[PDB]
Design a protein around this motif. Structure first.
Motif: not given
Ligand SMILES: [Ca+2]
Ligand SMILES: [Ca+2]
Length: 313
Positions: A20-24, A61-62, A115-119
């Motif tokens: 998911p975008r919340s992860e990357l 999205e996923e 800024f979600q997904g910044v790993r």
DNA sequence: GGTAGACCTGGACGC
DNA sequence: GCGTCCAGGTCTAC
């Protein structure tokens, strides 16, 4: 089919990884100063060299959609997709980290919303080491060009897509070779050209070669950071970048002007144990410790989120 | 031990 | 148009 692929153009050649975008968020990670090997060749599609092969990545999205250019086009295999999962350290749950950081830092929580997904990418030691040697007192756009010309001139030719020829990252031997500095100066690397040549030779002829660098991954942050600093062109900040992005030291916090602005503007931070009022070896070290006490064990990862956000501003 | 000054390059701005 | 600044800093004489 020729040229760079798109999810729509060559459907059968893409395989996905649940994500998911919340992860990357590729757009917030790949061009943000972690790796300088990725280009958005077509809208929302990023191409670059990963694990010695060229890949194009794009996401919905996923799903994180992947395609690889090796003979005879075919979707990525499970083993190859594993290479991707590991490069993006997908086992590390970003949502869990954001939650924690946001819980102990009201400002982070605010920024995190947008800024979600910044790993953090898990990079190859050599690629990371020399790319960052090229990053000092420089800007991402320029650095990116330098790294590309470096690989073109001394790295193995992989494949060509449209008018872009991808190259693997140079080996120590190639970088340690004769007249590398002179060639790199003509390629516009400036004074860093010497740092590249000099550091390649130092590792190979004084530290014991690749083994010395790769071993730092098992060593302690304090250990690794000190070791890297002996290398020409490698200071506290570059060493920190490498520890965080290639040697698995998630607590390493690179302190540059960006992190200083963030500290002063968003936390009203100022040195207390140091002496100077601005950046200095003393104050920089203190700021790094401040970020670690604020975010904990994965402080370097938290810093990456704010850094990325500060770039897009 | 702690400090500013220089430094390749090129895109930005302000005179 | 053109000189001063600056970017994911490091390396050095005083
Ligand atoms: Ca600067
Ligand atoms: Ca050094």
């Amino acid at each position: 089919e020729f040229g760079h692929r798109t999810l729509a153009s060559t459907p059968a050649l893409w395989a996905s990884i649940p994500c998911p975008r919340s992860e990357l968020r590729l757009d917030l990670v790949l061009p943000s100063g972690q790796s300088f090997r990725w280009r958005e060749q077509s809208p929302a599609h990023w191409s670059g060299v990963l694990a010695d092969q060229v890949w194009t990545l794009t996401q919905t999205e996923e799903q994180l959609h992947c395609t690889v250019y090796r003979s005879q086009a075919s979707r990525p295999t499970p083993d190859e997709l594993e290479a991707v999962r590991k490069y993006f350290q997908l086992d590390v749950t970003l949502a869990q980290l954001y939650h924690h950081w946001g819980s102990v830092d009201s400002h982070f929580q605010e920024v995190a919303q947008k800024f979600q997904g910044v790993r953090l990418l898990r990079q190859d030691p050599i690629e990371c080491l020399f790319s960052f040697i090229c990053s000092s007192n420089n800007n991402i756009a320029r650095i990116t060009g330098m790294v590309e010309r470096l690989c073109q001139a001394f790295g193995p030719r992989l494949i060509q897509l449209d008018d872009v020829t991808y190259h693997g990252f140079p080996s120590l031997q190639a970088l340690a070779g004769p007249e590398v500095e002179a060639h790199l100066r003509k390629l516009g690397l400036g004074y860093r050209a010497r740092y590249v040549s000099a550091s390649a030779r130092a590792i190979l002829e004084e530290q014991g070669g690749l083994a010395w660098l790769q071993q730092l991954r098992e060593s302690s942050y304090e250990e690794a950071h000190k070791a890297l600093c002996i290398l020409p062109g490698v200071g506290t900040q570059v060493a920190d970048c490498i520890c965080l992005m290639a040697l698995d030291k998630p607590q390493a916090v690179p302190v540059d002007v960006h992190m200083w602005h963030i500290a002063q503007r968003d936390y009203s931070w100022h040195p207390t144990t140091s002496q100077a009022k601005g950046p200095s070896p003393q104050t920089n070290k203190e700021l790094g410790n401040f970020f670690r006490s604020l975010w904990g064990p994965y402080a370097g990862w938290a810093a990456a989120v704010l850094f990325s956000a500060d770039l897009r501003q």
